[PDB]
Write a protein that binds this ligand. Structure first.
Ligand SMILES: NS(=O)(=O)c1ccc2c(c1)S(=O)(=O)NC2=O
Ligand SMILES: [Zn+2]
Length: 258
């Protein structure tokens, strides 16, 4: 009886195995744009993905991850609310069964069709494993996806999904450039939070971009063909793999723009 997104193992059940689910800095959260405040202390955000080297794509039964080689300082995120350098290790998405839902964070309660998470770990901790034991160990760059024109840069990901349909399947995925998934503007909201799936660790500095990228109905439809189940098992379409907004509690969301 593993955690998941269904009626009997979904988000409302996670707290039993992971009590931190009811913690003080859980994610995602609704971003109230009127309550968010411009923060002058935020430094310019730097997203340097020029030397990023992707390696493989994997269906882990919850979503699909595009993993990168993070043994050298290559694809890094810095600036903004961050102290130091954070290294890109993987990116994945959360999406819905319909275009009207799918994102984890919401903006004034608005849900987007999907949300892209580019996960980075703080290099001061030596490796990802040590980073997830720290309160400032991770930084996740979140980008909303809305349905409209296709995103050319996402098609290569869309086309390889047929090869990793079920849980446990992976495929070589080299030379993918994540710069093709970024919107024009880097304006963002930031707050301290957690991983949005078990183990729900509170080690994340969230940086959520205000400008969403547009993807086509056809591209998101292909996300919905993936399976939560493993090969040979009853088919459970991989849809609505998102966690709803959690209590903001004692936190303030800061904006990088006026
Ligand atoms: N959805 S997310 O908060 O980016 C996230 C959720 C789970 C995990 C991550 C990110 S991780 O740091 O790559 N390892 C995980 O288990
Ligand atoms: Zn995620």
């Amino acid at each position: 009886h593993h955690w998941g997104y269904g009626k009997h193992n979904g988000p409302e059940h996670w707290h039993k195995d992971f009590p931190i689910a009811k913690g003080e800095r859980q994610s995602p959260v609704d971003i109230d744009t009127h309550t968010a405040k411009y923060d002058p202390s935020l430094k310019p955000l730097s997203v340097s993905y020029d030397q990023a080297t992707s390696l493989r794509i994997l269906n882990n039964g919850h979503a699909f991850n595009v993993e990168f080689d993070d043994s050298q300082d290559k694809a890094v995120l810095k600036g903004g609310p961050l102290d130091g350098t954070y290294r890109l290790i993987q990116f994945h998405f959360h999406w819905g069964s319909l275009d009207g839902q799918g994102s984890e964070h919401t903006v004034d309660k608005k849900k987007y069709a999907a949300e892209l998470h580019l996960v980075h770990w703080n290099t001061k901790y030596g490796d990802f494993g040590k980073a997830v034991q720290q309160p400032d160990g991770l930084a996740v760059l979140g980008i909303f996806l809305k349905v409209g024109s296709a995103k050319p840069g996402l098609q290569k990901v869309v086309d390889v999904l047929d090869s990793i349909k079920t849980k446990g399947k992976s495929a070589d995925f080299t030379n993918f450039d994540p710069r093709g998934l970024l919107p024009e503007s880097l304006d963002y909201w930031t707050y301290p939070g957690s991983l949005t799936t078990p183990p729900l660790l509170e080690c994340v500095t969230w940086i959520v971009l205000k400008e969403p990228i547009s993807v086509s109905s056809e591209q998101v439809l292909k996300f919905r063909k993936l399976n939560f189940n493993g090969e040979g098992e009853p088919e459970e379409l991989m849809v609505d793999n998102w966690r709803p907004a959690q209590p903001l509690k004692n936190r303030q969301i800061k904006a990088s723009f006026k």
